[model samples]
Target: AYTEEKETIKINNIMIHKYTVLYTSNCIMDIYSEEEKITCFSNRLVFLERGVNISVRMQKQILSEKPYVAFALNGDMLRHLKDALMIIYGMSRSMSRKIMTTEVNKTLLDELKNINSHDNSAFISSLIYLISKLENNEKIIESIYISSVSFFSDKVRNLIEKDLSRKWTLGIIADAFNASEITIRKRLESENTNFNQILMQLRMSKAALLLLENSYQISQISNMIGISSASYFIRIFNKHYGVTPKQFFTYFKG
Candidate 1:
């Protein structure tokens, strides 16, 4: 249901490879490497290490929807940027994976969403420039602490999304990963988020998207997102978004 486009462009005299996937509907993608599996959602940017296999599953949408776009830069080209990062952060190649996984900030996220509409060379150059700008930010160094935590959280998120309709528990998820509940709790604790917090976040995000689509009854939306009680779903949805689901749908109707 999607096609891939590849391009090679030069940014700052370094050749960079870009792969873009254009999808007609929302999709969940699983990217697997020998070491890890990363679950990525449509319209969100995700970075991967080299040599991963990706599989996509499209979600049905009843309303008009824009084509969902996802893209990646070749890992080697990312290493080319690493030369610059080394100079900027005074980090060696041994720590380059951290550079690859640098979280996308809001500005980069916005730029990526509109990337298909921009001139390719200009966009690539601006993107490189933004990466270079991260050199002096002390926060980038601090982010290294959360980098591994983010990776662990991604695996946990993927498991939860696999069956959003199920009432998930620490025991269930820990069993899936073949780990102890205490281990799962500690890992999440290091990330400063707990299981229920993540569950609510994922549920509300999916609920908001469904609400915007405005094709389902409130109870149906609740059931689809794994919250069985429509009234409880409405209460938490309001708490999460500061508006009732109906209010959210009506506000977005224009």
Candidate 2:
């Protein structure tokens, strides 16, 4: 009879204190498919056996997906992954947390909704700092499952106050939070967000705001907002708001 089992391994019997980075630059997170295997997400990790071929079909896509449609693995990386999984197995209990189960944690995921990748990287970094802080506190961890309205640091608030002008990158925000680029990228992905996706969301918000104000003509809006291509902008707006700017203007006209 053929049987399947899931397990994790941790590297050190002891917990070492330093920044815990998930993986390497080439290490990717995307859709995964398994033969009836259980999948879960957490700060915890899993270990794969030596020569155990593993496949992951992550639901999230990075900017590079259009060119590469199928999932591939780096053998060297897999070796290291297996080793890290051993560490997890030794350390983490068998319990798994559903991404949606923790309300406050889920809310933490939703915070990205109000944000876009172009949102400051520093702000995103600050968020990680905040979440990691939560990860450290016992009372906070228990209360985390249901915390009231959350608050971000003054650093993030100040960044948001800066005009959503053109020439924005998540890096600018990340810089404000004094976070590295890789940290910002991973933090957003862990939350199911990516740079371009957030950028599109930000673009849509800018379009809608412009639509309400009716300050700039289509040409001007495209120019002022820094979306280089007008045609593409219209397409994106239609996709997001279900209306062209011209169509949205109708609501205010009558």
Candidate 3:
């Protein structure tokens, strides 16, 4: 089921519109800029500038997964925030957009996590206030810049592969880094990936190796990769490899 909804919130007497989309299946969504095509996966918060073309390809689900909820804040909405930041925080619009589009600190992330979606006006107000306060902290920004140089996807892959059987979530991975979920999410997005994609890739690749090794049964291999049900594992394996595990083993043997 796909549904779209809109809501309006006012900050400092400026009305901003927020749109929500609920995706009920795994889908490959593509957004094209004038110069490049960007492929986005589920559970990603993509911030598009104005006037971009988007298309979606929905894939049939082999395993039951949670629905993805995406929220879009229009540029018109951000225009007001940019103006406010410029006037009150003495920050340029480009600088405000950069900070907002990139990661905020843990305190701001915590504040954002606690606020109800219905009433985020206070959060926005406080976020601007906090940014103004943090603008002078050179040490914090320096650390973030240093961390940004390394590839987050590599770090995430290493973390996931460490304990392949553990049921992992974005929150779990974020806690490991002492970073916010959005921070990890944004970092992965910068590398054109999300938590689920990285996890799935690792699992599927590991399954491939185990299948080739022929040391374990299908059920055992499935369990090793954290999929509890053999049937679900087979379906996902088929989807990934275009063959059942048995077929894969047979072909490899031949």
Candidate 4:
């Protein structure tokens, strides 16, 4: 049964990653009903076959950063995936969401969290690797539970990198993923931070890096990082780090 307490919202107009991401609040992490499912988060993935009773104790911080986009397959994807696996590797759904006592290989799954952002081919190749790993372990309708604090942070950090030129509020970032600002808010809080701090950190880091390494004008650097005025940028930079960009450029060599 779906939780009645979950507040669900859909963004019909704005699209980010093909699917219309729906954010449901107050979700219980792992409880399967009469449906097989795939729930994808920024860092972790949970697969549940119908009536599989695997309790997932995912760290609360996993969902505390960027809002997670979950797609419910309702058995179609599972059926097709299993069919493909059977054809390719002679693997089959073991039936009744059979309980397999095999411990999940933390190494194989943990590697996904460290997937390189710049390597598309490597990421796709790992898909076959992952499928092979799962199929080799004799079971269908199995359960998986994964989480990491660093992965969650990277997910949001990557999202924020899209448009450093725009004023990225928590709402905009959340909506880009078709989620609520509250989801992003809590995630940051769990990571011992907040929205503004992250934005500032990203901006200042980028700006500082550019200033120290390149010869971009102060105004250009300011605009590139989304601040309206160079003067304003310098003020905030001074407040955050106790030195203006000019002072750093003149006195520091790196």
Candidate 5:
């Protein structure tokens, strides 16, 4: 899964430990500011997979430190990852519905703990091999995927689907995740979107579904979607979907 042209390479004065994995060139990463200072520090397992940058933070201290593993997976691997996550998500959902206890995969969790030790390269290589073979897995996703989307957007999508009546603001959503407002917005902006855009889209789409039910009045639907002002909802709904809620629902019964 990995091909090495050299022991190390030079980039921006940092000796990058580089390799090619799954048909793409990659480098081990260490986050630094413009002044070459470390940004985030963690003592325990800190798993972060953002865009093309995937890293496991296991540094206990600067001088007296443990081995920290960092690597990059190019777009191809990430494309496959979205499908893998979807399959895992679906499997968990199915298992939850069948047995009403928990969705945690203790077996997988136990295996993952081995990544923190010095014997990480072998494990990561095995992971790469497994990802390459995912196409042959039974009923795995084919073609249709959401690999370009940010992980934050994916979580927010699920959150929005579960509850539509919550008054969703940038601050409110950030607070719910115990994150800063700027952090939330910056992550969304990286994916070409924002908090308000997601909230508005989810609320408007859900409102349309409720309107089709016919049992709920327009006022009730408005409140159900956390829009206190019906007029305000209608105004924005028309702007996005090219029609007012009433006009859109007129085509369907109820």
Candidate 6:
């Protein structure tokens, strides 16, 4: 049945090590009928064809690291969650309820199967319980499928790489993606995630990466990254790390 396990997670308090399971059957997302929905994260979606039975636990993602909300999925029930995902993703509508497998990688299926065999509900159950902690974070990651979309030409990360050094104006990016600024903004939030909110996330993720890497002085990093002022970087950096950047760098190494 589809339902959330109910748990707590503030994105700030979340440890960097997390395993997220995205259940998709091929690419055809109208998952209610048995013929197409390929698999659950801990179960085989392919197995449905050869008389396999798969059960999915309910889950949720708080979605952002701040008090401001970002679009979140309700995995408390699989069919509704699957339907919501279909709308949010809006990929291929022609295929109906069956996943074609051509849209998703075969290796991904192998990996999920490997986990299904070895991990059992202990791990899948943990994923259901863990995602909620992200609710209280101040920022949400802008690109959800960077890893997927970047495969062809690094197209997605290229945008992230460029944005790392610039000031934000929603209209500018909206024009680039050929989407209405309002539409682009809604991927991260159901109704609104304005330019400022998106900018904060990029800066915060960059700050976190740099602090963890232990490369270059914060001042130098600020200049090289195009922030112009170390003082301003420090403010966002502190908020991202929940302490001064220096302290974060120090603790990160320890």
* Clash statistics: count for each candidate: 0, 28, 0, 2, 0, 19
lDDT string for model 1 (14-72, tens) is: 10112222222343444333334444544443443322222223332322332244355
Pairs that clash in candidate 1 = none
Writing each residue's lDDT as its tens digit, candidate 6 over 1-254 gives 95622222112311111112334322212223323332233222221111111222222233222111111222222233233334543533121211211222465434434443234344333323332233421111111111122121122224655757776466776776788866666653542234554455556656666766877778877865667788988876666545577654543343
Please tell me which model should have the higher TM-score, number 1 or number 4.
Answer: 1
| Predicted structure 5, TM vs. truth | 0.41
Name the candidate that leads on lDDT: 1
User: Weakest 10 consecutive residues, lDDT, candidate 3?
Assistant: 6-15
Residue runs of model 3 more than 4 Å from their true location after superposition:
1-150
User: At residue 173, what lDDT does model 5 achieve?
Assistant: 74
Measured against the true structure, the TM-scores of the candidates, in listed sequence, are 0.49, 0.35, 0.41, 0.41, 0.41, 0.39
Residue 99 error for model 1, in Å?
A: 18
For each candidate in the order shown, give its overall lDDT on alpha carbons.
0.53, 0.39, 0.52, 0.48, 0.46, 0.38
Winner by TM-score between candidate 5 and candidate 1: 1
TM-score of 4: 0.41
**Tens digits of per-residue lDDT for model 2 on 55-101?**
33322223222211111223333233334333433322111221111
RMSD of each: 15.3, 18.9, 19.6, 17.1, 21.4, 16.2
User: What TM value does model 1 have?
Assistant: 0.49
Better of 1 and 2 by TM-score: 1
**Lowest summed-lDDT stretch of 10 residues in model 4?**
12-21
Residue 75 of candidate 5: its Cα lDDT?
A: 49
Give the top-scoring candidate (TM-score).
1
User: Can you list the residue pairs that collide in candidate 5?
Assistant: none
- Candidate 4 structure quality by residue, lDDT tens digits, 126-243: 4345646665344332221111113344567678878877767788878866778888788767755677876777788688668877678999999999999899999987776555
